[model samples]
Target: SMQEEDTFRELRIFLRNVTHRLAIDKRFRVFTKPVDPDEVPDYRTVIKEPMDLSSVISKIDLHKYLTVKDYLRDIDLICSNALEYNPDRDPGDRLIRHRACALRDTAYAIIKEELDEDFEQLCEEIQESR
Candidate 1:
């Protein structure tokens, strides 16, 4: 229990840190909040799964991610999802897809800065547990 809790606590802090760093990004607003179904038809159809920053923060508080891998999977989805939904060479939907690429790299850099190497270290530690 002690070891597991310590690992999860570390993951939580990592998530909080990333979200705070991305909060003021000029391209952050659209992704910071949830997408309403009414805002776009077939959004549910196009994107089979949906994710947003507020939801990620909610899960962080809820302890929904018990490991670094789980957290990164979801965090990365927020960007990958946008890229999937909006794939265009030009500025489509005001370049939301382009912004997705920007935010995704920015987000990953934050993780690499703090947790990339250690993430693998922890993954090894927790690998046997899961």
Candidate 2:
């Protein structure tokens, strides 16, 4: 139970930092929208303020940000760290691995969906430039 609590605390901190970064960073504008000043300060209002993954995907040119291979590399590193953190695969470690994998999968799916359509076009452009 202590390990689980520690893991939960770590995750909360991680998420809090991420949310803060998204709120403050210009790059994250690709993922989040401007907060509506007029909206009521409520849970539903907060949820509605941020752009959906689809909205972000539709607005971005994946080639301009990162390639699928690059994304895979990033996810692989995350997975490696999660796996290496506990060799015995304790419950806390397992949970960490599962959460990390979920994050990777969801992000990859959104990226792939957006890039699949323009991948050929991007390739052609790259080829023409050289």
Candidate 3:
């Protein structure tokens, strides 16, 4: 039990560090202009919210529970949707760009919070163990 617990703890620490590093090193400067308030739609008010891998797995009728094919399909769909809001397309494309940036910010916030929490937890564990 201790070994398992220690392994899990170590994995959490590794994941937390990786996530923090990636988040910090990410190119967050994709948008230069001030986000126009009118350009961004209310994400919370949207009828079709973004779906995580687990959500899709739960909703889909799949023959098998988990597979590489399924994972790639989900990843592809997410990637496509992410690119669908490109700003350089047409007259109203700038609005899509703004919304995409806002959406990206939302995603970054969620990931950042997770990393922060994990880092805090790791610190607490280290302190308690010492």
Candidate 4:
């Protein structure tokens, strides 16, 4: 369907905006690349599906996201992985977790703001096709 094909370009452009902002975020930019287990330690064992800004960007170029839900999930994956790996127990991990929370909040805020008001109304249609 022409409409289906047409939706993708807008979706791709929209996703680019959100991701580029996330990449430059003060608290979130640190996660630009996949986690380095050696540098972080034990994070490899804790975070099963490690995600990062770079991966999302690459996926975008590859047209790997067929729906907004798929794109949303990858964005969600970044925050979820951080929250899961850094719990609120130890002081260090707790701080990390706090930042993760900030990261999650910032992610949503930026997306919602950039949506300039659609994600739920119009963007929902992005997933309805497939």
Q: lDDT tens digits, residues 45-90, model 2?
A: 4242333223333323233223345334544554454445434657
- Report backbone clashes per prediction: 0, 0, 0, 0
- Quantify all predictions' global Cα lDDT against the true fold: 0.78, 0.43, 0.43, 0.75
Better of 1 and 4 by lDDT: 1
What TM value does model 3 have?
Answer: 0.33
lDDT of 1 by residue, 35-119 (tens): 8878888788888889988888899999887666677787689888888877767766548976777887887787777776766
Candidate 4: stretches off by over 4 Å: 116-130
> What's the CA error at residue 66 for candidate 4, in Å?
2.8
67 in model 4: Cα distance from truth in Å? 3.0
Candidate 2 all-Cα RMSD: 18.7
Candidate numbers, best TM-score first, in rank order: 1, 4, 2, 3
Q: What is the C-alpha lDDT profile of model 3 across 3-67, one tens digit per residue?
A: 54564455444444432443343342333222333865653243244533344433333322122
Rank order by lDDT, top first? Answer: 1, 4, 2, 3
Better of 1 and 3 by lDDT: 1
The TM-score of candidate 1 is 0.82
Q: Give the C-alpha lDDT of model 1.
A: 0.78
True lDDT of residue 34, candidate 3: 29
Top candidate when judged by TM-score against the true structure:
1
